[PDB]
Amino acid sequence: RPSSWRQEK
Amino acid sequence: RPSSWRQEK
Amino acid sequence: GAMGSMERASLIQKAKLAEQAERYEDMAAFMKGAVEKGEELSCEERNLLSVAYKNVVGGQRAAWRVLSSIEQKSNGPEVREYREKVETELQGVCDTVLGLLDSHLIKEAGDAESRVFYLKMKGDYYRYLAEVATGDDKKRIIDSARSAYQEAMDISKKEMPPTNPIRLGLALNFSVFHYEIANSPEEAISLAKTTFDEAMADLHTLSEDSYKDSTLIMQLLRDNLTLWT
Amino acid sequence: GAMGSMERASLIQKAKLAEQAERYEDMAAFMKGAVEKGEELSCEERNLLSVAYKNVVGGQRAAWRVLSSIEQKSNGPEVREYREKVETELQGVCDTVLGLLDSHLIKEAGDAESRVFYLKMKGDYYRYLAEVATGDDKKRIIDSARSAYQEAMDISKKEMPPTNPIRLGLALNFSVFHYEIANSPEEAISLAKTTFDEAMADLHTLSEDSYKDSTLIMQLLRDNLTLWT
Ligand SMILES: *Cc1ccc(-n2ccnc2-c2ccccc2)c(OC)c1
Ligand SMILES: *Cc1ccc(-n2ccnc2-c2ccccc2)c(OC)c1
Ligand SMILES: [Ca+2]
Ligand SMILES: [Ca+2]
Ligand SMILES: [Cl-]
Ligand SMILES: [Cl-]
Ligand SMILES: [Mg+2]
Ligand SMILES: [Mg+2]
């Protein structure tokens, strides 16, 4: 459910 | 480029 | 048979689970094991076989086109080597599908719906092989796709109504073959148009659900005609 | 070493090609071979290692959650067996990444940017192991993730500005660990809020490009605080 780090879009 | 058969969405 | 120890019904159940998890490599391996049980496939089971390998080869084709486009702009050996690696893996999947159809799905398919489905698959995966062919076997690969499509067309026009979704999808892909592979755009346009019109004249016979099945594929024919004309 | 015969520079080049083709399994295999050359990784090379294995394990985690949700609603053995198969494959990828960090990326990383990056990775992949753990090793797996995150936090607060993207991403993931794994939502909220505020007060020192790097990750912290409060 929560956001971990992810690459930019 | 053209569309072959594909499953419904 | 890596799946030789699993029950046929369990392989089908796990193929449906792999589809829900979008694990199409697993799905293809399950359906390959189900086919190798030696029994004919039901309508639903044929759909699972199509879904699994179309998604697998679909990702391979998309990756191949990305790498081939990078290779064309460049012309080290790395780009060529990696495009060759993906290309070899794509050809292995196509050879696997064609092997399943030849041993022994096609020869045991007597009904029109099953036989046309398998022959359309045979044309499709020879078409995917033709997309990457460059050597001495390209013309024979192209003719192998054309021959499989043609036999499927002959049966479908004899045994199926013009609105049958398999007949429609077959004509759609054969027209794509004509345009993209055989350098016959006028044959592609003529096939797509007559397929659309003859299905349109048969829609009045269909139920609400069959109407939706047919018009969905008719829209794909319309999209190509808009792109080609 | 299946990649032992390929040049290190060729492995890096093909890893970038696999990223462009969205072939993340190939990308991880290339970067694994590059790491096993025995040399430290550059900043760009560390990014390639992260991108490859995050996408691979990301698809495995998504498939595992689909299968586990089907399994919970049901409770044949097929659903459990297939969830176990995906789970075992996910654990193998996590063990592979942790093995690369332990042999010998972490012990050779002296700079703060490299050491914090690897320790954050160690916490991340122990966190992914903890998501699926149910036996006698769950608490030790959870503490292994906590210990790796904590050492990374200690170094980052000593050697990095509050706006450093690695420090921000580390705090973001440690806060997710607190909320999702450690059953400490108040620690998760407190960490996410102090990380956001202290980065906000440091934005005035940054260039336009560094400003965009930091605010991107600050938005992820804001998204979680909105979800949690
Ligand atoms: C190539 C093709 C055409 C049509 C279908 N299709 C649409 C709706 N149902 C089907 C179908 C399902 C199972 C077996 C045959 C046809 C299609 O689906 C695989 C493929
Ligand atoms: C976990 C994490 C945080 C931040 C980044 N990142 C954002 C912009 N650049 C980076 C970066 C690139 C290479 C090495 C370290 C950080 C990130 O990217 C992998 C990961
Ligand atoms: Ca049996
Ligand atoms: Ca060398
Ligand atoms: Cl290669
Ligand atoms: Cl299984
Ligand atoms: Mg028969
Ligand atoms: Mg060093």
Side-chain angles (χ1 to χ4, degrees), chain A residues 2-8, chain B residues 2-8, chain C residues 1-71 74 76-135 138-229, chain D residues 1-71 74 76-135 138-229:
Chain A
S3 296
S4 59
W5 178 86
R6 57 164 180 264
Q7 203 176 249
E8 44 198 294
Chain B
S3 296
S4 59
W5 178 86
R6 57 164 180 264
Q7 203 176 249
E8 44 198 294
Chain C
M3 302 296 169
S5 70
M6 202 179 311
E7 288 273 21
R8 185 188 191 279
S10 299
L11 291 164
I12 298 300
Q13 179 175 357
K14 292 182 186 183
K16 296 176 185 170
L17 291 170
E19 181 182 26
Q20 291 180 266
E22 297 177 50
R23 298 261 301 192
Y24 297 110
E25 284 196 19
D26 288 348
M27 194 189 180
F30 291 141
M31 289 310 298
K32 179 174 187 287
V35 166
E36 290 170 350
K37 296 300 176 182
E39 305 258 48
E40 298 176 26
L41 298 188
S42 74
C43 171
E44 180 177 15
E45 290 159 357
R46 294 195 294 276
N47 170 72
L48 297 171
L49 179 75
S50 160
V51 168
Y53 277 109
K54 284 273 161 133
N55 277 279
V56 166
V57 80
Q60 297 173 322
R61 292 161 75 209
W64 184 92
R65 297 191 289 263
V66 165
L67 298 175
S68 170
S69 159
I70 295 170
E71 186 180 15
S74 71
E78 285 86 5
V79 173
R80 177 192 60 80
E81 289 172 346
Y82 187 42
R83 189 266 302 155
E84 284 176 359
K85 172 193 179 166
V86 175
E87 178 175 308
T88 301
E89 291 191 3
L90 185 157
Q91 292 165 326
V93 168
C94 289
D95 289 337
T96 289
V97 173
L98 293 168
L100 293 171
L101 296 168
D102 201 51
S103 306
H104 301 272
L105 286 169
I106 288 178
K107 65 169 55 70
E108 291 299 336
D111 289 358
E113 172 161 8
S114 62
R115 186 165 188 88
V116 170
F117 183 91
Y118 292 136
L119 289 170
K120 171 187 173 181
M121 284 193 60
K122 184 172 187 169
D124 283 345
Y125 283 88
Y126 270 114
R127 170 161 59 90
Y128 305 149
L129 283 179
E131 287 178 339
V132 308
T134 51
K138 173 126 185 273
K139 287 165 145 166
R140 271 183 274 270
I141 290 169
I142 289 175
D143 199 68
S144 288
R146 180 211 56 78
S147 177
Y149 280 140
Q150 187 59 244
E151 184 183 351
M153 290 286 300
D154 294 346
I155 300 175
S156 69
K157 303 223 260 311
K158 219 94 78 182
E159 310 283 345
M160 293 168 165
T163 46
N164 182 275
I166 301 164
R167 177 173 169 177
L168 290 176
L170 162 67
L172 176 67
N173 287 5
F174 198 16
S175 67
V176 166
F177 165 86
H178 285 311
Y179 198 96
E180 277 200 305
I181 311 294
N183 193 37
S184 309
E186 288 176 337
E187 183 72 13
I189 294 164
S190 296
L191 176 55
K193 200 215 147 46
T194 54
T195 301
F196 183 93
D197 290 349
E198 290 166 24
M200 177 72 61
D202 193 56
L203 287 177
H204 73 92
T205 67
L206 303 184
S207 69
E208 175 161 344
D209 282 5
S210 299
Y211 179 90
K212 284 182 191 183
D213 291 339
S214 305
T215 53
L216 272 176
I217 308 179
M218 291 171 62
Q219 181 63 50
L220 300 182
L221 290 159
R222 173 62 45 191
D223 292 339
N224 287 348
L225 288 165
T226 295
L227 181 67
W228 298 339
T229 59
Chain D
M3 302 296 169
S5 70
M6 202 179 311
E7 288 273 21
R8 185 188 191 279
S10 299
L11 291 164
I12 298 300
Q13 179 175 357
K14 292 182 186 183
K16 296 176 185 170
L17 291 170
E19 181 182 26
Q20 291 180 266
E22 297 177 50
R23 298 261 301 192
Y24 297 110
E25 284 196 19
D26 288 348
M27 194 189 180
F30 291 141
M31 289 310 298
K32 179 174 187 287
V35 166
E36 290 170 350
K37 296 300 176 182
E39 305 258 48
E40 298 176 26
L41 298 188
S42 74
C43 171
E44 180 177 15
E45 290 159 357
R46 294 195 294 276
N47 170 72
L48 297 171
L49 179 75
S50 160
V51 168
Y53 277 109
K54 284 273 161 133
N55 277 279
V56 166
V57 80
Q60 297 173 322
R61 292 161 75 209
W64 184 92
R65 297 191 289 263
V66 165
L67 298 175
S68 170
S69 159
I70 295 170
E71 186 180 15
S74 71
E78 285 86 5
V79 173
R80 177 192 60 80
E81 289 172 346
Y82 187 42
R83 189 266 302 155
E84 284 176 359
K85 172 193 179 166
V86 175
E87 178 175 308
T88 301
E89 291 191 3
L90 185 157
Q91 292 165 326
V93 168
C94 289
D95 289 337
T96 289
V97 173
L98 293 168
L100 293 171
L101 296 168
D102 201 51
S103 306
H104 301 272
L105 286 169
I106 288 178
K107 65 169 55 70
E108 291 299 336
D111 289 358
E113 172 161 8
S114 62
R115 186 165 188 88
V116 170
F117 183 91
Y118 292 136
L119 289 170
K120 171 187 173 181
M121 284 193 60
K122 184 172 187 169
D124 283 345
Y125 283 88
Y126 270 114
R127 170 161 59 90
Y128 305 149
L129 283 179
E131 287 178 339
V132 308
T134 51
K138 173 126 185 273
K139 287 165 145 166
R140 271 183 274 270
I141 290 169
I142 289 175
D143 199 68
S144 288
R146 180 211 56 78
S147 177
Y149 280 140
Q150 187 59 244
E151 184 183 351
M153 290 286 300
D154 294 346
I155 300 175
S156 69
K157 303 223 260 311
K158 219 94 78 182
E159 310 283 345
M160 293 168 165
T163 46
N164 182 275
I166 301 164
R167 177 173 169 177
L168 290 176
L170 162 67
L172 176 67
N173 287 5
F174 198 16
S175 67
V176 166
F177 165 86
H178 285 311
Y179 198 96
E180 277 200 305
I181 311 294
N183 193 37
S184 309
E186 288 176 337
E187 183 72 13
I189 294 164
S190 296
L191 176 55
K193 200 215 147 46
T194 54
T195 301
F196 183 93
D197 290 349
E198 290 166 24
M200 177 72 61
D202 193 56
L203 287 177
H204 73 92
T205 67
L206 303 184
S207 69
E208 175 161 344
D209 282 5
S210 299
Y211 179 90
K212 284 182 191 183
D213 291 339
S214 305
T215 53
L216 272 176
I217 308 179
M218 291 171 62
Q219 181 63 50
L220 300 182
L221 290 159
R222 173 62 45 191
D223 292 339
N224 287 348
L225 288 165
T226 295
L227 181 67
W228 298 339
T229 59

